[PDB]
Design a protein around this nucleic acid. Sequence first.
RNA 1: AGGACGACAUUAGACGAAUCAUCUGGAAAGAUGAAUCAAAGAAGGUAAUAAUCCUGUAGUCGAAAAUGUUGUCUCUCUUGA
RNA 2: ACCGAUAGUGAACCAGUACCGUGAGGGAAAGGUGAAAAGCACCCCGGAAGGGGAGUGAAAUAGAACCUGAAACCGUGUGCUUACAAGUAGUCAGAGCCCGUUAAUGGGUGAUGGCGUGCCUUUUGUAGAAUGAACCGGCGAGUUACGAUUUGAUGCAAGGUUAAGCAGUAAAUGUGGAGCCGUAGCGAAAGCGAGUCUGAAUAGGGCGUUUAGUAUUUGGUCGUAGACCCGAAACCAGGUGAU
RNA 3: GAGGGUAGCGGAGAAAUUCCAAUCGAACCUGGAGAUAGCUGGUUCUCUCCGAAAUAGCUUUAGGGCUAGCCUCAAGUGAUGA
RNA 4: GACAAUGGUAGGAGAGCGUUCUAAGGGCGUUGAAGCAUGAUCGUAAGGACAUGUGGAGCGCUUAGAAGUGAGAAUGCCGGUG
RNA 5: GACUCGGUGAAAUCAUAGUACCUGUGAAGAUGCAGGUUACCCGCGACAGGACGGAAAGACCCCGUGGAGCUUUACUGUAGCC
Lengths: 131, 60, 45
Amino acid sequence: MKLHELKPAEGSRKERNRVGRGVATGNGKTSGRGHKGQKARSGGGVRPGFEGGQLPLFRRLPKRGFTNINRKEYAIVNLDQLNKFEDGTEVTPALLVESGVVKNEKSGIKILGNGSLDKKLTVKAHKFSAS
Amino acid sequence: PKMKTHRGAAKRVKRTASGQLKRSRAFTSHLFANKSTKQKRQLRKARLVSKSDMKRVKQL
Amino acid sequence: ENEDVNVELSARNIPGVQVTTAQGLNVLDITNADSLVITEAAAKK
RNA sequence: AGGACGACAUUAGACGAAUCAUCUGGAAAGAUGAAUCAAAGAAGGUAAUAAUCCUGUAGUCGAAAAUGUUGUCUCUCUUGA
RNA sequence: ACCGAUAGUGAACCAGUACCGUGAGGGAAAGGUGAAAAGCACCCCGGAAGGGGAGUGAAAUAGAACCUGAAACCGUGUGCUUACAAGUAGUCAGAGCCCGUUAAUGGGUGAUGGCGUGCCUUUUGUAGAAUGAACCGGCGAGUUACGAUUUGAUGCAAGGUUAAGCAGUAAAUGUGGAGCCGUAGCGAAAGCGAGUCUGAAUAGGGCGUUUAGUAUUUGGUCGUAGACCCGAAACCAGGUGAU
RNA sequence: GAGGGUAGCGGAGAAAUUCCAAUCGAACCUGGAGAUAGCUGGUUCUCUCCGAAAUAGCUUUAGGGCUAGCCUCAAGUGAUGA
RNA sequence: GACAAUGGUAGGAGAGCGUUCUAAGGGCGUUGAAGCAUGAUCGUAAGGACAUGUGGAGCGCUUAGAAGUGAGAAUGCCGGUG
RNA sequence: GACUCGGUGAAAUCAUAGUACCUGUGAAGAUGCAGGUUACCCGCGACAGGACGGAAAGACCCCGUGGAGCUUUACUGUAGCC
Ligand SMILES: C=C[C@]1(C)C[C@@H](OC(=O)CS[C@@H]2CC[C@@H](N)C[C@H]2O)[C@]2(C)[C@H](C)CC[C@]3(CCC(=O)[C@H]32)[C@@H](C)[C@@H]1O
Ligand SMILES: [Mg+2]
Ligand SMILES: [Mg+2]
Ligand SMILES: [Mg+2]
Ligand SMILES: [Mg+2]
Ligand SMILES: [Mg+2]
Ligand SMILES: [Mg+2]
Ligand SMILES: [Mg+2]
Ligand SMILES: [Mg+2]
Ligand SMILES: [Mg+2]
Ligand SMILES: [Mg+2]
Ligand SMILES: [Mg+2]
Ligand SMILES: [Mg+2]
Ligand SMILES: [Mg+2]
Ligand SMILES: [Mg+2]
Ligand SMILES: [Mg+2]
Ligand SMILES: [Mg+2]
Ligand SMILES: [Mg+2]
Ligand SMILES: [Mg+2]
Ligand SMILES: [Mg+2]
Ligand SMILES: [Mg+2]
Ligand SMILES: [Mg+2]
Ligand SMILES: [Mg+2]
Ligand SMILES: [Mg+2]
Ligand SMILES: [Mg+2]
Ligand SMILES: [Mg+2]
Ligand SMILES: [Mg+2]
Ligand SMILES: [Mg+2]
Ligand SMILES: [Mg+2]
Ligand SMILES: [Mg+2]
Ligand SMILES: [Mg+2]
Ligand SMILES: [Mg+2]
Ligand SMILES: [Mg+2]
Ligand SMILES: [Mg+2]
Ligand SMILES: [Mg+2]
Ligand SMILES: [Mg+2]
Ligand SMILES: [Mg+2]
Ligand SMILES: [Mg+2]
Ligand SMILES: [Mg+2]
Ligand SMILES: [Mg+2]
Ligand SMILES: [Mg+2]
Ligand SMILES: [Mg+2]
Ligand SMILES: [Mg+2]
Ligand SMILES: [Mg+2]
Ligand SMILES: [Mg+2]
Ligand SMILES: [Mg+2]
Ligand SMILES: [Mg+2]
Ligand SMILES: [Mn+2]
Ligand SMILES: [Mn+2]
Ligand SMILES: [Mn+2]
Ligand SMILES: [Mn+2]
Ligand SMILES: [Mn+2]
Ligand SMILES: [Mn+2]
Ligand SMILES: [Mn+2]
Ligand SMILES: [Mn+2]
Ligand SMILES: [Mn+2]
Ligand SMILES: [Mn+2]
Ligand SMILES: [Mn+2]
Ligand SMILES: [Mn+2]
Ligand SMILES: [Mn+2]
Ligand SMILES: [Mn+2]
Ligand SMILES: [Mn+2]
Ligand SMILES: [Mn+2]
Ligand SMILES: [Mn+2]
Ligand SMILES: [Mn+2]
Ligand SMILES: [Mn+2]
Ligand SMILES: [Mn+2]
Ligand SMILES: [Mn+2]
Ligand SMILES: [Mn+2]
Ligand SMILES: [Mn+2]
Ligand SMILES: [Mn+2]
Ligand SMILES: [Mn+2]
Ligand SMILES: [Mn+2]
Ligand SMILES: [Mn+2]
Ligand SMILES: [Mn+2]
Ligand SMILES: [Mn+2]
Ligand SMILES: [Mn+2]
Ligand SMILES: [Mn+2]
Ligand SMILES: [Mn+2]
Ligand SMILES: [Mn+2]
Ligand SMILES: [Mn+2]
Ligand SMILES: [Mn+2]
Ligand SMILES: [Mn+2]
Ligand SMILES: [Mn+2]
Ligand SMILES: [Mn+2]
Ligand SMILES: [Mn+2]
Ligand SMILES: [Mn+2]
Ligand SMILES: [Mn+2]
Ligand SMILES: [Mn+2]
Ligand SMILES: [Mn+2]
Ligand SMILES: [Mn+2]
Ligand SMILES: [Mn+2]
Ligand SMILES: [Mn+2]
Ligand SMILES: [Mn+2]
Ligand SMILES: [Mn+2]
Ligand SMILES: [Mn+2]
Ligand SMILES: [Mn+2]
Ligand SMILES: [Mn+2]
Ligand SMILES: [Mn+2]
Ligand SMILES: [Mn+2]
Ligand SMILES: [Mn+2]
Ligand SMILES: [Mn+2]
Ligand SMILES: [Mn+2]
Ligand SMILES: [Mn+2]
Ligand SMILES: [Mn+2]
Ligand SMILES: [Mn+2]
Ligand SMILES: [Mn+2]
Ligand SMILES: [Mn+2]
Ligand SMILES: [Mn+2]
Ligand SMILES: [Mn+2]
Ligand SMILES: [Mn+2]
Ligand SMILES: [Mn+2]
């Protein structure tokens, strides 16, 4: 890189298509023919003449939702929990420790809502916690 | 402008890639077809996700 | 300032080290991080 | 709830570094020779393309006056728990 | 990494001016001698216009209608050609005559022979008697912003990444971890969780687990915008008009 | 003939859709405004590789559109194709 | 070195030419730039040089960037001349 | 008035033109294609068969989920009146 010998990374960057500049180019109708390849061009947005983006409806929603840490809690050293917001977890509406993997440590699982299998494995090692 | 989400897709919910969908003829005229009636079950799109693609898509 | 007033000498340019552009650095052909500075750019990885 | 003593800024400006020769030319700022200044190699001009020819530029200085803004004294108004 | 006189203001010129309308209102065209006016003393033809000498100048084959001065179009000169011939005008073959180049199995013209119904558009199909264009010139149409998606590229990677703001010369650049996507899914939901939903079922079945993401970005495409460009008849609002 | 009055969702009409500044089934000007135009026309360099369709379904749809079908580019499967 | 493939409209995909601006490098220019004209020149194409005349002051080249980037047709707009 | 001379000097049109006829052919009525037939070059005064002559993006007709004016026991309104 010597500023008069700049060379952009291989396979990045490719010349934009320019429609409507000639015929040999392969684009002078530009594209379409006769139809609504007119300028306004509205297809409609997503439709035919028979609306199938609608059949019936099913819905509701209340407040809830937690944040999952799997029994791959076997990363950290010993004792403690919730602190690991400084190690490996980010946004938490509330922090639940699920099962999955297989525990390899003895440590306090101070958290809100413990998944059952995970509780059996964490307790099979040593520590447990709640709230 | 961020595209507006279609709100008439309060009618599907994202699976993993594919959208789970409502069905058929629930409510009205139940006086007809009986094995038909046990068609409480899901859907997707296939041919149609091509059409509806980016509208129910801030539904991630 | 002063060292910086080696300014109007055509080819020369002279910034800090918390300065240090990607360009100025390689329009450059030769550099001379002084010593303190060399140690700081070394410190600010 | 209106007015007396000076700082700075606005409205003219001043200072401001260092190049000569030959070739070609209608004319050189170009070319080739030797030089020089630089807190000034921004820019524009001069018979072609000028850091040192000119207007300037870095920098420094500057206000009788008239607003302008503020530092602090005066001036008022004040019994707070 | 805005225009450079058909551009850029409507207006680089004494532009809201000539001009048009009763009025509200509409609205142009038109920049460039030269370094310096040194802007052609004098003689000549001519009433003058204009010109040829002689001069200024580097240049007037820069002379004022002035830099450069393309094309249509108009002329003078002519080397080859043409008055028994039926022509989309060329192409292929070819004698004769004239010439001599970016020197190469050269250039101009062309008796005669073969073949041969322009282009665009639009069409099932156009020599078409379907559309368009008198000619030459200039000017004239897929853009940008923001979101989405996808591919390529690059950095990290169970993680990736900052926004506003503060700092800095309208900076590549340090700060800022609010935020966002991802490491878990399933159900309308309560909720449960490598599983969950339906289900009386520890059946069957649906979605799901067997880890790769995420930020920036070239290209493709979509959305929101006038969203390739030119064109209505018309609607509405506020004025101006009974000369 | 002179001076006046009535003005556009209005005026005036011995009535004809008649006149309102040289085309009045609703004047003129400016704006909204780049109204909208599934219609028509136009859309500017080159070569290389592949290469359609004018069909079905639904459509206030029928010279428009959508999904399929046919084209291409790219991954992937791998003898399933003729 | 053999051996295959290479008509093509809508349309997909690929490689490129030329224009203006910018960055960096490297050059040309009053002993004549650009432009204009003329030529029997070069490359598969878009397109590139060269020599001469005109002109009288600016311009190429490499590599990368970015575009008001390419006209023959719109009863297109403006000018000129038939 | 036309026509001859002197003076002055437009226009609509126009893809380029060296622009014959018959019988065919053909997008089904051909200066331009085939096969024949005819025809030396260039004007002037005249005629109106053809150039589907010029002029006006057909007014009839159909189409567009165009416009506008009008009607009514079409729909929904509303100024006003009881
Ligand atoms: C367009 C018409 C005319 C002048 C005559 C036309 O007559 C009509 O159309 C009669 S409709 C009449 C027309 C005026 C309307 N305002 C009222 C309405 O009643 C006629 C006779 C044909 C039937 C059609 C073709 C024709 C070619 C030669 C010919 O014989 C012509 C067209 C091309 C021609 O230009
Ligand atoms: Mg719905
Ligand atoms: Mg001399
Ligand atoms: Mg300085
Ligand atoms: Mg200078
Ligand atoms: Mg006017
Ligand atoms: Mg008027
Ligand atoms: Mg007018
Ligand atoms: Mg001349
Ligand atoms: Mg002659
Ligand atoms: Mg010869
Ligand atoms: Mg001949
Ligand atoms: Mg011949
Ligand atoms: Mg033919
Ligand atoms: Mg014309
Ligand atoms: Mg862009
Ligand atoms: Mg990637
Ligand atoms: Mg990556
Ligand atoms: Mg993109
Ligand atoms: Mg707008
Ligand atoms: Mg109104
Ligand atoms: Mg009167
Ligand atoms: Mg009045
Ligand atoms: Mg009345
Ligand atoms: Mg409409
Ligand atoms: Mg239609
Ligand atoms: Mg394959
Ligand atoms: Mg060039
Ligand atoms: Mg040269
Ligand atoms: Mg000379
Ligand atoms: Mg010639
Ligand atoms: Mg040439
Ligand atoms: Mg010369
Ligand atoms: Mg030359
Ligand atoms: Mg000069
Ligand atoms: Mg050069
Ligand atoms: Mg580039
Ligand atoms: Mg034209
Ligand atoms: Mg015309
Ligand atoms: Mg004209
Ligand atoms: Mg007479
Ligand atoms: Mg004319
Ligand atoms: Mg004749
Ligand atoms: Mg026809
Ligand atoms: Mg016939
Ligand atoms: Mg109709
Ligand atoms: Mg009322
Ligand atoms: Mn390309
Ligand atoms: Mn094509
Ligand atoms: Mn078209
Ligand atoms: Mn189409
Ligand atoms: Mn289009
Ligand atoms: Mn439009
Ligand atoms: Mn819709
Ligand atoms: Mn969910
Ligand atoms: Mn049935
Ligand atoms: Mn001075
Ligand atoms: Mn000086
Ligand atoms: Mn000198
Ligand atoms: Mn100069
Ligand atoms: Mn100063
Ligand atoms: Mn202008
Ligand atoms: Mn010009
Ligand atoms: Mn007037
Ligand atoms: Mn001058
Ligand atoms: Mn003379
Ligand atoms: Mn002289
Ligand atoms: Mn002239
Ligand atoms: Mn000049
Ligand atoms: Mn001239
Ligand atoms: Mn003869
Ligand atoms: Mn014939
Ligand atoms: Mn030949
Ligand atoms: Mn023939
Ligand atoms: Mn074309
Ligand atoms: Mn035609
Ligand atoms: Mn004809
Ligand atoms: Mn037509
Ligand atoms: Mn025409
Ligand atoms: Mn033209
Ligand atoms: Mn700041
Ligand atoms: Mn089960
Ligand atoms: Mn299961
Ligand atoms: Mn399963
Ligand atoms: Mn885009
Ligand atoms: Mn699409
Ligand atoms: Mn678009
Ligand atoms: Mn009537
Ligand atoms: Mn009438
Ligand atoms: Mn009357
Ligand atoms: Mn009238
Ligand atoms: Mn009207
Ligand atoms: Mn509007
Ligand atoms: Mn319009
Ligand atoms: Mn093929
Ligand atoms: Mn059916
Ligand atoms: Mn319907
Ligand atoms: Mn069609
Ligand atoms: Mn088989
Ligand atoms: Mn091919
Ligand atoms: Mn072939
Ligand atoms: Mn393409
Ligand atoms: Mn240039
Ligand atoms: Mn353009
Ligand atoms: Mn006469
Ligand atoms: Mn004849
Ligand atoms: Mn034919
Ligand atoms: Mn026939
Ligand atoms: Mn015939
Ligand atoms: Mn005659
Ligand atoms: Mn007559
Ligand atoms: Mn028509």
